[PDB]
Design a protein around this ligand. Structure first.
Ligand SMILES: *[C@@H]1O[C@H](CO)[C@@H](O[C@@H]2O[C@H](CO)[C@@H](O)[C@H](O)[C@H]2NC(C)=O)[C@H](O)[C@H]1NC(C)=O
Ligand SMILES: *[C@@H]1O[C@H](CO)[C@@H](O[C@@H]2O[C@H](CO)[C@@H](O)[C@H](O)[C@H]2NC(C)=O)[C@H](O)[C@H]1NC(C)=O
Ligand SMILES: *[C@@H]1O[C@H](CO)[C@@H](O)[C@H](O)[C@H]1NC(C)=O
Ligand SMILES: [Ca+2]
Ligand SMILES: [Ca+2]
Ligand SMILES: [Ca+2]
Ligand SMILES: [Ca+2]
Ligand code: NA
Lengths: 188, 105, 187, 108
């Protein structure tokens, strides 16, 4: 059925784990931005790589030219048709980013990547979530393994939509699970 | 947006669309790439469900009894054969999920 | 004789050493931007903290409001009079940054800090160098993870007791950046 | 009243933006024109440090590392006992000051 894509030969930065923050729970319809900062380097391209939690196989990339920042291929246009992106030259490095509105279908693992035609060096990962399923004192970011939210005072507790609850922020397999489980909720 | 259609990359002079090489590389979207993206080569522990074309990547699946890890390095992992005592099994072994084990404590 | 400032109660992020890149050799006159990215947090303020390699004590801070990014105090004004800065709200976090032309007097250790009136959490350090000295030409590259001094334009490395710098497109005053430089290496 | 929305060094601004309130001498300070709700806390010299100059409402305390120690600029920015002299075979090229450790170079 659906055509898929990926990076043929993936590599990870040494500090990938220590620079990638714990997953973040965001309200549906909030505008967020994936920010990517990279020190001047020698790859021809850069990308923002997306693996959505739902109904998604492979990975989709927005590939930009690493020198000038122009779009080379927007592999994200079908799942994120309104997304915008930016690129800044800081001489010592570059900031590139992807802006979109969060929803259930846009929840996913979002990576910053140095790219060539066969290889990608994955520098950093952001996990954006809208729902947490359980069978807690949610805070704003504070270093570690702890799931968080930019607006934790709006955290809610539903039942469906065992011994089970549904956590979200607010006003089918989940491919993010093997990453999500590596982090924890706050005890208190 | 993009000069060249799927299965193509742009020529050096920016004038032409040149086809990807079948079984070597591909491109899924309209694009301004100077080259196509290399096809994924399935690994040991993986079954090729579908070959690379110039317009879609190879589909590699984790062998039966193993599942796809999405954390680094995104390889196939052997499924657990079951849960320890005092735990109930919830999930079951698919190519995209290990079995889940929940405690009662 | 000169007024100094500092963070009274310093603190360092857990991943401070892994996120802070090796120092960078840059040509004088080049405009650079110190980029700072923070996840939405609960401090009232953020800052860009500078400690210059030459003729400087304590630290100078551009203090911004953490929510809206308004300048609260520009402690950098004397030393970087023509500097500009930026703040972007990403909801999941904020990016704030500082742009200036590199010179001998602006070489320094630059840091992204979460701030209150008494405490600062130093998140990340950038070290901007204009000159490197040695005793007795290394294959200077662009950035790669590690402890390796590097440059954005290494093809312009020149060699003036040796002296290394990046040519455009000596001294004896103490170098306050030495204790940090020495923890890294040339190629 | 603020100058251009700003309160002068030695002051911070009030919540409503009307008043400039003086910092408390010995406790806090501001070096520049500012819109701060509070003045910045003065550094207290840790042991290992000598107070060369006190905090005033307008400048921070000046703390200097004790003789025989030097200021480390890497985390955690504390004073460190200068290391012993250079080994036989190696030449001393840095001398222990409040801002430098001793530096040694080999003949290799
Ligand atoms: C795409 O990037 C990869 C990885 O950086 C390149 O493969 C490396 O090539 C270098 C230099 O030729 C070798 O020293 C390494 O053995 C390779 N590293 C790895 C991890 O494979 C590849 O050459 C690049 N492709 C192009 C066209 O430049
Ligand atoms: C300024 O920041 C510091 C560090 O977060 C705060 O000091 C902490 O205060 C909390 C709660 O009062 C305590 O759990 C810790 O003992 C303090 N931490 C450290 C590292 O000393 C301080 O409260 C903040 N100041 C204000 C006025 O909000
Ligand atoms: C700084 O130098 C840049 C080029 O790097 C130039 O555009 C500009 O004239 C200078 N600006 C200031 C404010 O000094
Ligand atoms: Ca939110
Ligand atoms: Ca991804
Ligand atoms: Ca202070
Ligand atoms: Ca005072
Ligand atoms: Na755009």
């Amino acid at each position: 059925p659906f055509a898929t894509a990926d990076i043929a030969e993936k590599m990870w930065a040494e500090n990938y784990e220590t620079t990638s923050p714990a997953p973040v729970l965001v309200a549906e319809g909030e505008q967020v931005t994936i920010p990517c900062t990279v020190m001047t380097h020698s790859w021809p391209m850069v990308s923002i790589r997306a693996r959505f939690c739902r109904s998604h196989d492979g990975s989709d990339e927005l590939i930009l030219d690493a020198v000038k920042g122009h779009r080379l291929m927007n592999g994200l246009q079908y799942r994120l048709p309104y997304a915008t992106w930016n690129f800044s030259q800081l001489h010592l490095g570059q900031i590139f980013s992807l802006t979109f509105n969060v929803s259930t279908d846009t929840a996913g693992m979002y990576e910053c990547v140095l790219r060539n035609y066969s290889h990608g060096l994955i520098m950093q990962r952001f996990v954006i979530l809208t729902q947490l399923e359980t069978l807690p004192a949610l805070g704003r970011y504070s270093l570690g393994d702890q799931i968080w939210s930019p607006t934790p005072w709006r955290l809610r507790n539903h039942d469906c939509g065992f011994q089970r609850n549904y956590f979200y922020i607010g006003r089918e397999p989940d491919r993010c699970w093997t990453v999500i489980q590596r982090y924890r909720l706050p005890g208190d | 947006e993009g000069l060249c259609p799927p299965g193509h990359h742009i020529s050096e002079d920016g004038r032409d669309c040149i086809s990807c090489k079948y079984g070597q590389d591909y491109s899924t979207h309209w694009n301004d790439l100077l080259f196509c993206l290399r096809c994924t080569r399935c690994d040991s522990g993986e079954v090729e469900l579908s070959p690379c074309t110039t317009t879609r990547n190879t589909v590699c699946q984790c062998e039966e009894g193993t599942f796809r890890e999405e954390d680094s390095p995104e390889m196939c992992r052997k499924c657990r054969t079951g849960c320890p005592r005092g735990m109930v099994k919830v999930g079951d072994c698919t190519p995209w999920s290990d079995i889940e084990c929940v405690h009662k404590e």
